[PDB]
Amino acid sequence: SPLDSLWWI
Amino acid sequence: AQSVTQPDARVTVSEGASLQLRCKYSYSATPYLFWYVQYPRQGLQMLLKYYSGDPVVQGVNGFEAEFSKSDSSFHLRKASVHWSDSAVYFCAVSAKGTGSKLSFGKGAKLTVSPNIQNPDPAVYQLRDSKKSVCLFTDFDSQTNVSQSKDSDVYITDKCVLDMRSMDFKSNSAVAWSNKSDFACANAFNNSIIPEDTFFPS
Amino acid sequence: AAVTQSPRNKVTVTGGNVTLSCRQTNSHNYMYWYRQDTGHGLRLIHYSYGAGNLQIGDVPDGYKATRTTQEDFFLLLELASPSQTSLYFCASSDAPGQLYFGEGSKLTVLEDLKNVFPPEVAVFEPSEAEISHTQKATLVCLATGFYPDHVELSWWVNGKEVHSGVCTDPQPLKEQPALNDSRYALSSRLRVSATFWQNPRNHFRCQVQFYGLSENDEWTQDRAKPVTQIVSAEAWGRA
Amino acid sequence: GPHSMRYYETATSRRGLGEPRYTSVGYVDDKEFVRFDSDAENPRYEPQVPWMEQEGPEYWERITQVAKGQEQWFRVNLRTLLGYYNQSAGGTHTLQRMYGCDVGSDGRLLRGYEQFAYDGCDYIALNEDLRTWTAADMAAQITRRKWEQAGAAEYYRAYLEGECVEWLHRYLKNG
Numbered sequence: 001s002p003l004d005s006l007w008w009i
Numbered sequence: 010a011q012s013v014t015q016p017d018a019r020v021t022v023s024e025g026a027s028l029q030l031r032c033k034y035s036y037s038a039t040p041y042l043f044w045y046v047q048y049p050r051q052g053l054q055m056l057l058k059y060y061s062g063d064p065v066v067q068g069v070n071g072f073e074a075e076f077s078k079s080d081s082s083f084h085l086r087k088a089s090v091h092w093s094d095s096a097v098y099f100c101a102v103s104a105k106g107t108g109s110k111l112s113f114g115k116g117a118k119l120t121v122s123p124n125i126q127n128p129d130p131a132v133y134q135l136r137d138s139k140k141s142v143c144l145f146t147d148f149d150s151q152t153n154v155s156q157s158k159d160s161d162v163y164i165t166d167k168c169v170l171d172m173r174s175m176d177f178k179s180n181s182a183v184a185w186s187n188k189s190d191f192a193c194a195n196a197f198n199n200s201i202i203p204e205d206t207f208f209p210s
Numbered sequence: 211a212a213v214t215q216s217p218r219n220k221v222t223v224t225g226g227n228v229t230l231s232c233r234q235t236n237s238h239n240y241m242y243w244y245r246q247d248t249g250h251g252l253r254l255i256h257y258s259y260g261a262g263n264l265q266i267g268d269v270p271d272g273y274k275a276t277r278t279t280q281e282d283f284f285l286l287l288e289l290a291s292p293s294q295t296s297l298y299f300c301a302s303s304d305a306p307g308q309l310y311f312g313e314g315s316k317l318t319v320l321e322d323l324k325n326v327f328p329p330e331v332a333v334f335e336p337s338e339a340e341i342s343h344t345q346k347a348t349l350v351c352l353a354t355g356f357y358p359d360h361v362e363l364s365w366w367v368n369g370k371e372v373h374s375g376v377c378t379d380p381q382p383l384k385e386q387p388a389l390n391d392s393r394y395a396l397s398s399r400l401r402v403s404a405t406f407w408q409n410p411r412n413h414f415r416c417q418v419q420f421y422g423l424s425e426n427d428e429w430t431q432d433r434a435k436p437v438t439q440i441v442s443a444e445a446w447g448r449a
Numbered sequence: 450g451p452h453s454m455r456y457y458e459t460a461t462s463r464r465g466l467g468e469p470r471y472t473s474v475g476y477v478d479d480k481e482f483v484r485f486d487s488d489a490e491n492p493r494y495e496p497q498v499p500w501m502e503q504e505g506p507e508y509w510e511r512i513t514q515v516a517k518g519q520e521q522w523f524r525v526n527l528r529t530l531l532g533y534y535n536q537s538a539g540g541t542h543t544l545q546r547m548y549g550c551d552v553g554s555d556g557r558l559l560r561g562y563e564q565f566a567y568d569g570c571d572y573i574a575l576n577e578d579l580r581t582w583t584a585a586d587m588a589a590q591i592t593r594r595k596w597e598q599a600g601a602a603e604y605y606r607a608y609l610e611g612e613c614v615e616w617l618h619r620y621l622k623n624g
Contacts, residue, residue: 168399
């Protein structure tokens with residue numbers, strides 16, 4: 001199951 | 010479309026009592042949920058964050074919120090609130106991935122009445138240093154101060170000061186008037202004050 | 211929160227041009243400008259997801275914004291209207307919905323300068339009755355007859371600002387509640403132990419920073435120009 | 450024996466006012482088992498192997514929402530990188546993310562991944578300690594700084610040590 005990314009580049 | 014609904018703009022609870030602050034949101038996709046807190050004279054700051062997984066999220070000082078997908082709710086709760094919790098609390102919902110889809114609630118101003126261990130209600134007269142003011146002080150949190158039914162009489166709302174060294178808090182309201190014959194005995198005439206209020210002199 | 215807004219306080223007249231600066235040195239991606247008003251909560255004006263990008267918020271009318279750099283997000287009021295009298299917050303964001311707020315910029319747009327008055331300030335010494343009954347001493351400061359509602363009251367003991375034992379009204383009273391140009395009044399208390407107050411070596415001072423006219427504003431009336439200024443009242447400890 | 454689950458996310462900006470194409474491909478033991486493609490007409494995660502068919506609608510909806518969020522996330526990132534490296538809008542660029550977990554024969558985490566490549570070049574990567582980041586260059590240093598300040602490592606490690614391992618195990622259970 002894929003994961004949400006939070007803090008942007 | 011996206012929105013957040015907090016039902017009560019203003020909430021008062023007694024120190025030591027439990028707290029629930031309600032929040033409903035409307036958003037078509039799966040959201041991130043937040044509670045922000047704004048202490049007096051400051052900006053907002055994150056208090057609670059929900060990303061995914063466990064519906065119950067936790068924060069500093071015993072704060073927590075519960076995500077309910079079925080009800081579209083994110084109610085905040087705390088077992089026992091204290092004077093320092095007095096602030097404005099904002100619920101917020103955000104789309105994932107972007108910062109372009111964020112909505113704040115109207116916010117809820119929480120007033121926590123301090124527990125006044127040793128009430129000593131009194132109405133004192135102060136002299137001008139450089140004219141005279143009346144000081145209603147040391148009453149329990151429950152007492153409320155009413156406005157004067159006299160335009161030339163000014164009465165401020167209750168105010169809590171904290172002598173931090175002394176671990177001692179107290180309520181006070183101020184009344185003053187330019188008009189001659191203004192008296193401290195009748196200053197807070199149309200407020201409901203304790204029958205045991207001390208009137209010196 | 212590494213977000214700093216400037217100026218923190220601003221007074222202008224209708225038609226004036228106002229620029230608020232917001233800088234965040236953490237190079238967050240998103241930046242927002244909000245206004246906060248009683249009964250309307252927090253309302254989004256403009257935001258940006260990067261240098262050169264601008265997105266209108268919910269209440270953009272009368273406002274422009276510019277993201278000149280990743281760190282800088284200016285808010286511009288072109289022809290200042292009294293309705294823009296508000297408390298403005300800038301915020302940066304490094305993750306979806308995660309914001310870090312500035313300290314706030316309080317602005318008042320005046321419609322008519324002749325309504326501007328600085329506060330009169332008076333300190334009232336503690337009652338001896340309170341002294342004996344409680345062994346505590348409450349000083350009361352009164353700032354009266356000021357307009358606009360843009361003051362900051364602080365207590366100073368022996369030349370240093372104190373916060374302990376202090377409570378200041380969150381909201382000022384309208385002296386003439388029925389008038390739109392009504393002047394304001396504000397009260398504050400400083401409570402100390404009786405033995406501290408009764409030491410005549412102790413110096414007490416209530417200071418009120420008033421924000422009004424600038425050096426640039428022209429003034430015609432005879433009375434003293436109600437410029438931005440500090441008005442204060444003092445008292446020495448009484449034994 | 451040992452196993453692994455890896456996801457590859459790619460965001461490629463078109464030319465002119467072209468919305469980027471976002472793709473996400475999931476592998477188990479280096480074999481594609483799931484896929485999402487923005488270009489598709491009805492974009493959602495689709496099973497690439499019959500043994501994944503057993504996952505109910507709730508599952509497919511949930512992970513599709515993740516992809517939806519990721520697309521926006523990558524859009525923000527692409528525009529941000531142009532700023533980091535001083536580049537023009539019309540162009541075509543690619544940001545790739547690779548994350549997932551290697552699991553040992555003992556059933557424990559061998560290693561965890563969370564790394565990015567921009568235009569074929571290494572950018573930033575989560576170190577084996579799952580605590581520290583390796584920044585390839587100047588821009589990557591800005592990112593690392595923010596992610597260190599944000600405490601990002603803990604979020605991704607939590608996934609890598611928990612859900613990643615568990616889901617891999619669940620997927621294997623099929624066959």
